[PDB]
Paper text:
The yeaZ gene product forms part of the conserved network YjeE/YeaZ/YgjD essential for survival of many eubacteria. and V. parahaemolyticus (C. Thomas, personal communication, 19 November 2010) demonstrated that among other as yet unidentified roles, YeaZ functions as a resuscitation promoting factor required for cells to be able to survive in, and exit from, a VBNC state. The structure of VpYeaZ confirmed that it is a member of the ASKHA superfamily of actin-like nucleotide-binding proteins characterized by two domains (I and II) that hold a nucleotide-binding site in the interdomain cleft. EcYeaZ has been shown to interact with the conserved essential proteins YjeE and YgjD, with YgjD being the preferred interaction partner.
Author numbering:
A (entry chain D), B (entry chain A): 2 to 213
The structure:
Amino acid sequence: AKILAIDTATENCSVALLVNDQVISRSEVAPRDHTKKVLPMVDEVLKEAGLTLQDLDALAFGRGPGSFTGVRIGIGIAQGLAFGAELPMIGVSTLAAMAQASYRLHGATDVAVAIDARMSEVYWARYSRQENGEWIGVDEECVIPPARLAEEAQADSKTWTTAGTGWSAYQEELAGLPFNTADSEVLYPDSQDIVILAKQELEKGNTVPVEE
Amino acid sequence: AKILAIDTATENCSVALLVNDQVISRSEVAPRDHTKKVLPMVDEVLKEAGLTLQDLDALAFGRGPGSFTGVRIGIGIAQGLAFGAELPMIGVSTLAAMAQASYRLHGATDVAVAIDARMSEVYWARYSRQENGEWIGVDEECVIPPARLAEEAQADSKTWTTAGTGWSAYQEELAGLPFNTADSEVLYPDSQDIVILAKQELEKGNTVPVEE
């Protein structure tokens, strides 16, 4: 179960490595650039483990949504390094990714992810931890102006723990629909969790090739 | 002398491979995306040569200028692939790159590269082929509004073959200074030429590590 993940999707540049239920995580809440940090971290991660790229049996990545430039860049490195160790690959949703963090720290089964898209819109989904440890998609991945989100889907009555930067960027507007809600201390996805999501795609045989 | 170059700087996505004075080139005048074409080409290149990444003794890349997203993306793959074959690397100027093409087709020793920056400015340099085959930098790499370029530097009296997309996007304005000039059929850099530039950085011992 040897997986190495990269994420470059939001403000947080992160790289982590699962080697048999032992996730050594690296993170950096990043700037205008990304390249300059992503390799050295992958190097750090691996030396602190004695693995090589061809040791790993999968290479995982934030597939987005998230920043256009950024989310491309990391996929670009994630291909680069896969190609050379002949690795299969695993794309992983930034949204569901943040749902896992919300379990990891808060033990929440009910997660509402809202990522601040640019120009007045929001990347949104909701997920729901099912018995297996998986996440039933309670709402499809969308991009919506939060206003419209509020008047669509009356949906349920449940305590959704809110994650990602949509929340703090459009309160006025996400303030408008009875779902129960809870603050989260979570802003961005992290490769910590991304791995643990990827670790179950393997066990479902759900990996692409290398040129996805 | 085994070098593989990637370029993703302008509208032209290109990958080529020098294996002993034999450059098998791949090119594609590309769209809104880049990832999807860059790997397969690097794969194509290598099968039609029986080399692997760890066969090569350097991996080169367009360092830019050029499109922000683009130029990051290629650099991102060119690190990814370097890292896994433990390769040294070689960044290469898109401008001087296009100077080489202008030799390759037209045999020009006097090149004026102007790339259409966005928002009313231009990426510009001038190079001059010295006896060795190197290129004296007749003007430092810049980013100027073409207007200002015209009234700066009276400079010389010589026949500069113009390349890159500045020329056709600001004629009125680049039309204003006596240098002699000649049309070129050249618009973007190509990994064809990038390699032959890289092949000489090696011979000067001028390669960075892998996390440049």
